[PDB]
Design an enzyme around this catalytic site. Structure first.
Site, PDB file in Angstrom:
ATOM      1  N   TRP A  65      -8.843  -2.570  17.808  1.00 54.35           N
ATOM      2  CA  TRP A  65      -8.635  -1.944  16.523  1.00 54.35           C
ATOM      3  C   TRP A  65      -9.945  -1.503  15.988  1.00 54.35           C
ATOM      4  O   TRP A  65     -10.896  -1.952  16.189  1.00 54.35           O
ATOM      5  CB  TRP A  65      -8.057  -3.066  15.378  1.00 54.35           C
ATOM      6  CG  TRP A  65      -6.779  -3.620  15.681  1.00 54.35           C
ATOM      7  CD1 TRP A  65      -5.809  -3.623  16.590  1.00 54.35           C
ATOM      8  CD2 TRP A  65      -6.107  -4.543  14.697  1.00 54.35           C
ATOM      9  NE1 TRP A  65      -4.838  -4.646  16.570  1.00 54.35           N
ATOM     10  CE2 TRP A  65      -4.984  -5.135  15.473  1.00 54.35           C
ATOM     11  CE3 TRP A  65      -6.286  -5.080  13.425  1.00 54.35           C
ATOM     12  CZ2 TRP A  65      -4.267  -6.024  14.657  1.00 54.35           C
ATOM     13  CZ3 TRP A  65      -5.635  -6.124  12.872  1.00 54.35           C
ATOM     14  CH2 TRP A  65      -4.467  -6.299  13.444  1.00 54.35           C
ATOM     15  N   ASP A 130      -1.433  10.768  -0.423  1.00 53.10           N
ATOM     16  CA  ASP A 130      -2.117  11.957  -1.013  1.00 53.10           C
ATOM     17  C   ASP A 130      -2.306  12.745   0.286  1.00 53.10           C
ATOM     18  O   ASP A 130      -3.202  12.719   1.060  1.00 53.10           O
ATOM     19  CB  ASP A 130      -3.268  11.840  -1.604  1.00 53.10           C
ATOM     20  CG  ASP A 130      -3.783  13.203  -2.028  1.00 53.10           C
ATOM     21  OD1 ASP A 130      -3.432  14.222  -1.438  1.00 53.10           O
ATOM     22  OD2 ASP A 130      -4.506  12.916  -3.155  1.00 53.10           O
ATOM     23  N   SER A 132      -3.059  15.842   1.069  1.00 55.71           N
ATOM     24  CA  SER A 132      -4.428  16.579   1.053  1.00 55.71           C
ATOM     25  C   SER A 132      -5.673  15.856   1.578  1.00 55.71           C
ATOM     26  O   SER A 132      -6.443  16.241   2.407  1.00 55.71           O
ATOM     27  CB  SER A 132      -4.705  17.272  -0.262  1.00 55.71           C
ATOM     28  OG  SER A 132      -5.511  16.303  -1.285  1.00 55.71           O
ATOM     29  N   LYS A 133      -5.594  14.526   1.182  1.00 61.14           N
ATOM     30  CA  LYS A 133      -6.593  13.723   1.658  1.00 61.14           C
ATOM     31  C   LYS A 133      -6.288  13.205   3.189  1.00 61.14           C
ATOM     32  O   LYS A 133      -7.302  13.211   4.043  1.00 61.14           O
ATOM     33  CB  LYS A 133      -6.817  12.599   0.935  1.00 61.14           C
ATOM     34  CG  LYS A 133      -7.319  12.950  -0.396  1.00 61.14           C
ATOM     35  CD  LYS A 133      -7.698  11.968  -1.562  1.00 61.14           C
ATOM     36  CE  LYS A 133      -8.096  12.252  -2.630  1.00 61.14           C
ATOM     37  NZ  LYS A 133      -8.231  11.055  -3.797  1.00 61.14           N
ATOM     38  N   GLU A 163       1.607  -3.067  12.656  1.00 62.47           N
ATOM     39  CA  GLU A 163       2.563  -3.736  11.460  1.00 62.47           C
ATOM     40  C   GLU A 163       2.301  -3.177  10.204  1.00 62.47           C
ATOM     41  O   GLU A 163       2.213  -3.555   9.264  1.00 62.47           O
ATOM     42  CB  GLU A 163       2.182  -5.345  11.558  1.00 62.47           C
ATOM     43  CG  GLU A 163       2.117  -6.038  12.823  1.00 62.47           C
ATOM     44  CD  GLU A 163       1.748  -7.380  12.768  1.00 62.47           C
ATOM     45  OE1 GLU A 163       1.376  -7.977  11.580  1.00 62.47           O
ATOM     46  OE2 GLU A 163       2.103  -7.944  13.874  1.00 62.47           O
ATOM     47  N   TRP A 191       4.252  -8.673   2.932  1.00 61.59           N
ATOM     48  CA  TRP A 191       3.202  -9.754   2.153  1.00 61.59           C
ATOM     49  C   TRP A 191       1.873  -9.118   1.730  1.00 61.59           C
ATOM     50  O   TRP A 191       1.219  -9.765   1.080  1.00 61.59           O
ATOM     51  CB  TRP A 191       3.003 -10.809   3.465  1.00 61.59           C
ATOM     52  CG  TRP A 191       2.163  -9.853   4.557  1.00 61.59           C
ATOM     53  CD1 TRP A 191       1.011  -9.733   4.899  1.00 61.59           C
ATOM     54  CD2 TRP A 191       2.796  -9.645   6.006  1.00 61.59           C
ATOM     55  NE1 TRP A 191       0.620  -9.345   6.147  1.00 61.59           N
ATOM     56  CE2 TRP A 191       1.605  -9.094   7.054  1.00 61.59           C
ATOM     57  CE3 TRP A 191       4.165  -9.433   6.233  1.00 61.59           C
ATOM     58  CZ2 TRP A 191       2.051  -8.503   8.057  1.00 61.59           C
ATOM     59  CZ3 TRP A 191       4.440  -8.918   7.739  1.00 61.59           C
ATOM     60  CH2 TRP A 191       3.224  -8.346   8.504  1.00 61.59           C
ATOM     61  N   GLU A 293       2.204  -8.248  20.683  1.00 63.37           N
ATOM     62  CA  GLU A 293       1.655  -9.579  20.414  1.00 63.37           C
ATOM     63  C   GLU A 293       2.518 -10.608  20.295  1.00 63.37           C
ATOM     64  O   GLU A 293       3.703 -10.535  20.122  1.00 63.37           O
ATOM     65  CB  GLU A 293       1.152  -9.416  18.949  1.00 63.37           C
ATOM     66  CG  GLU A 293       0.166  -8.591  18.472  1.00 63.37           C
ATOM     67  CD  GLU A 293      -0.420  -8.551  16.871  1.00 63.37           C
ATOM     68  OE1 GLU A 293       0.072  -9.597  16.392  1.00 63.37           O
ATOM     69  OE2 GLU A 293      -0.801  -7.590  16.372  1.00 63.37           O
ATOM     70  N   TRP A 322      -2.163 -12.899  21.885  1.00 61.58           N
ATOM     71  CA  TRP A 322      -3.103 -12.900  20.611  1.00 61.58           C
ATOM     72  C   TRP A 322      -3.829 -13.804  20.576  1.00 61.58           C
ATOM     73  O   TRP A 322      -3.365 -15.268  20.571  1.00 61.58           O
ATOM     74  CB  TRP A 322      -2.062 -12.658  19.419  1.00 61.58           C
ATOM     75  CG  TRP A 322      -2.895 -12.552  18.174  1.00 61.58           C
ATOM     76  CD1 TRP A 322      -3.276 -13.664  17.524  1.00 61.58           C
ATOM     77  CD2 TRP A 322      -3.379 -11.421  17.755  1.00 61.58           C
ATOM     78  NE1 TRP A 322      -4.139 -13.171  16.333  1.00 61.58           N
ATOM     79  CE2 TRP A 322      -4.134 -11.658  16.574  1.00 61.58           C
ATOM     80  CE3 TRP A 322      -3.234 -10.176  17.954  1.00 61.58           C
ATOM     81  CZ2 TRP A 322      -5.008 -10.917  15.627  1.00 61.58           C
ATOM     82  CZ3 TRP A 322      -3.935  -9.137  17.030  1.00 61.58           C
ATOM     83  CH2 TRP A 322      -4.613  -9.336  16.164  1.00 61.58           C
ATOM     84  N   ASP A 329      -5.357 -17.529  12.501  1.00 58.16           N
ATOM     85  CA  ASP A 329      -4.112 -18.211  12.541  1.00 58.16           C
ATOM     86  C   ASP A 329      -3.389 -17.555  13.744  1.00 58.16           C
ATOM     87  O   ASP A 329      -3.625 -16.136  14.010  1.00 58.16           O
ATOM     88  CB  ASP A 329      -3.372 -18.000  11.405  1.00 58.16           C
ATOM     89  CG  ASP A 329      -4.159 -19.152  10.311  1.00 58.16           C
ATOM     90  OD1 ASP A 329      -4.858 -19.855  10.558  1.00 58.16           O
ATOM     91  OD2 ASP A 329      -3.615 -18.849   9.009  1.00 58.16           O
TER      92      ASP A 329
END
Length: 361
Positions: A65, A130, A132-133, A163, A191, A293, A322, A329
């Protein structure tokens, strides 16, 4: 030159069906592994050691990641427009180094841009809302990175968001079934935030399209938190089909190549439609599917070997445990995950998951 691809509903490399067996890293220093000179100062040796140790146990792949919640990268200006991958423009070279090590070890790398399993920082959330961003993210950070990395043989694929269902507004009706999240009611989705599904899909569709323009051979995936968002069977819905992603974001190129379901037990039981309990064919998907995972600790008592075995033999195109860093956890130790990698080493049943001992040369 051959890169990982999809044909006839199978994951393939060169002529051959291949199975991605490996671990989620998923990070060393969360959100701070690549970019801002971190790889050379701080993270690169640990990250390269994971590649080596995974291969040594018989794995052939990994998932890692990058921006996560947007807290460190990418680089936002004072108005929230993106100006680059990172302040020091090291991200691309950092990933390059990582990918060169992966190639030297015959390990395929899957790169995850964003995290949906935690609440976004405001600059990242604003990219979802947005356009544009978002387009500055795409043009100033993503496209240049993707293009520059488009020749790295160990780049297995990109993934826009881990996720998305962590940040989605679940249990909400819509006239367009693609945007209707009633099949997620009571699932525990949402969540971390309550963003409309349509906005998540649009975010995904646009960035996927942009990756494929920048690198027209690379594959893209999207890891859902359970089967509940990646199948139209079992009472669920598949939110990341070509038709839903295009309906949301408008870009015909913004389609993924393999589905990816994560699965963990809740109160010591998997769902009856968990990909570790049903064969992938029951999902009746139009792309291969990776169990992206799972973990022994986050299961129902079955062993890590049972889980890798199931993925390999019941129709999936990969299994990523994982996680290599052992943390948090539902993470197994590296040693436990290694047992599953060991179990698949040397397998090559083309009638089952296919080749494990891949050679990237």
């Amino acid at each position: 030159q051959q890169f990982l691809d999809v044909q006839n509903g199978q994951l393939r490399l060169n002529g051959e069906k291949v199975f991605m067996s490996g671990m989620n890293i998923a990070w060393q220093n969360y959100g701070r592994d690549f970019g801002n000179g971190q790889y050379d100062c701080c993270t690169g040796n640990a990250l390269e050691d994971y590649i080596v140790r995974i291969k040594a146990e018989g794995g052939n792949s990994l998932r890692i990641w990058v921006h996560c919640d947007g807290g460190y990268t990418p680089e936002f200006d004072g108005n929230g427009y993106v100006v680059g991958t990172d302040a020091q423009n090291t991200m691309t070279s950092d990933l390059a180094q990582f990918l060169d090590v992966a190639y030297a070890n015959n390990v395929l790398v899957f790169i995850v841009l964003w995290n949906g399993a935690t609440t976004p920082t405001s600059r990242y959330r604003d990219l979802i809302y947005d356009d544009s961003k978002l387009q500055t993210y795409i043009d100033q950070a993503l496209v240049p990175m993707v293009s520059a990395l488009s020749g790295k043989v160990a780049l297995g694929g990109w993934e826009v968001m881990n996720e998305p269902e962590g940040i989605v507004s679940a249990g909400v009706s819509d006239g367009n079934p693609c945007f209707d999240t009633q099949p997620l009611a009571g699932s525990g989705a949402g969540w971390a935030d309550s963003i409309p599904m349509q906005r998540l899909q649009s975010f995904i569709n646009k960035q996927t399209a942009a990756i494929k323009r920048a690198d027209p051979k690379v594959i893209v995936t999207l890891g859902s938190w359970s089967e509940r968002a990646q199948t139209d069977q079992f009472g669920w819905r598949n939110y990341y089909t070509d038709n839903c992603l295009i309906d949301a974001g408008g870009d015909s190129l913004g389609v993924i190549d393999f589905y990816q379901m994560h699965t963990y037990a809740w109160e010591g039981a998997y769902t009856s439609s968990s990909p570790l309990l049903v064969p992938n064919s029951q999902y009746n998907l139009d792309k291969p599917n990776n169990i992206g995972e799972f973990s022994q600790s986050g299961g129902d008592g079955r062993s890590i070997t049972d889980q890798f075995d199931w993925a390999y033999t019941q129709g999936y195109c990969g299994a990523w445990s994982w996680q290599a860093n052992g943390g948090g956890d539902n993470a197994d130790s590296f040693a436990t995950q290694a047992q599953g990698l060991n179990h698949l080493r040397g397998r090559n049943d083309q009638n089952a998951g296919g080749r494990i001992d891949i050679i990237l040369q």
